[PDB]
Ligand binder design. Structure first.
Ligand SMILES: O=c1ccn([C@@H]2O[C@H](COP(=O)(O)OP(=O)(O)O)[C@@H](O)[C@H]2O)c(=O)[nH]1
Ligand SMILES: [Mn+2]
Length: 338
């Protein structure tokens, strides 16, 4: 079997037939894929709808004893059951192009990808990263492409890549768990490919867990079997994206003041796993934020964010278009900030 399509469900009764129909409609031999549904203890008739398809599909159907609260444990249970040469995770409210498995199979037989990104399309207003799907590419890296900007598991992974390297979703960390999963796949993959010929994938609490995942990602990058300068650059790119687009961006302007110490402490533990030499590699505006996160100093961290957002700085000059900023009295100057 080429493929195991892995589907975590939870009270998906109103929309699961869209996914199930798109899998039944695959222009691909039924003998060469299975559909692995693990249900997160739904209280509706999800399982009964799923059963209607057991003749159109090779279907494995499981259900957890109690709701795990997220797709991590369901997907892990399915991954242990998968016998496909490759796995594809599709969420219960999404669906795929009828030629997805056929095209992916042909691309894999031509290029032997270990991780294969497949172009996504947002429906009903949803987006959907795009900057890495402008072209089809048989081989990309973390440094010459934009793959680090999509870490959802809505991708194709060589089953043996995951299992031989013990790559599973963290079950006890309910936030951003797929970022660690896909980062680990990327870092262990001998070949990462991007297939963009058509739209294939149609897409529809405290921060302790969140920043533990981020810290595990930092440790994972730094420990990979890659050149040292390349690890540092990869970590810098991950930090660029994380501070620009994650919940970290602007948290000191949005989070209740009483809760920001808890944020800065958990963020600080993440950034403290980033060696300081890496700060020189990150976008300059983020350097004061890395500095005050490591020191776990929320007052100065918040002044930086507030200064950026209102254009006021305690002391600054401009040298060839870039600012040298002292954000508060007695604090270090940060130089060359765009
Ligand atoms: O307790 C839960 C809740 C969600 N899900 C599944 O995990 C995936 C999370 O997807 P969802 O579409 O709800 O997230 P979103 O679209 O908001 O990103 C879906 O396949 C759900 O069926 C789950 O397995 N357990
Ligand atoms: Mn969804």
């Amino acid at each position: 079997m080429k493929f195991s399509v892995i589907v975590p469900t939870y009270n998906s009764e109103k929309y699961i037939t869209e996914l199930l129909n798109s899998l039944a409609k695959q222009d691909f031999p039924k003998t060469e894929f299975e559909v692995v549904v693990v249900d997160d203890c739904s209280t509706d008739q999800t399982l009964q709808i799923v059963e209607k398809y057991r003749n159109k599909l090779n279907l494995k159907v499981s259900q957890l004893e109690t709701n795990s609260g997220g797709p991590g444990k369901p997907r892990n249970v399915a991954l242990k059951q998968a016998e496909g040469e490759f796995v594809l995770f599709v969420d219960s409210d999404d669906y795929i192009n009828k030629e997805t498995l056929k095209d992916a199979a042909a691309f894999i037989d031509e290029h032997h990808s270990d991780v294969l990104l497949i172009k996504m399309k947002g429906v009903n207003g949803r987006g959907v990263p795009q900057s890495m799907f402008k072209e089809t590419a048989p081989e990309v890296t973390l440094l010459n492409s934009r793959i680090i900007y999509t870490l959802s598991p809505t991708k194709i992974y060589r089953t043996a890549l995951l299992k031989d390297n013990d790559i599973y979703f963290p079950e006890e960390l309910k936030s951003a768990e797929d970022q660690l999963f896909t980062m680990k796949a990327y870092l262990n993959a001998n070949r990462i490919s991007v297939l963009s010929d058509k739209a294939y994938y149609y897409a529809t609490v405290s921060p302790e867990d969140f920043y533990e995942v981020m810290r595990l990602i930092a440790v994972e990058i730094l420990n990979a079997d890659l050149e040292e300068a390349h690890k540092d650059q990869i970590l810098a790119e991950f930090l660029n994206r994380h501070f620009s687009f994650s919940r970290t961006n602007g948290f000191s302007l949005k989070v209740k003041l009483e809760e920001q110490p808890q944020w800065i402490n958990a963020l600080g533990d993440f950034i403290q796993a980033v060696p300081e030499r890496v700060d020189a590699l990150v976008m300059s505006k983020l350097r004061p934020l890395l500095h005050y996160a490591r020191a776990k100093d929320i007052d100065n961290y918040r002044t930086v964010e507030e200064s950026y957002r209102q254009g006021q700085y305690y002391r600054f000059d401009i040298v060839d278009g870039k600012l040298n900023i002292q954000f508060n009295e007695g604090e270090p100057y940060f130089e060359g900030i765009d």
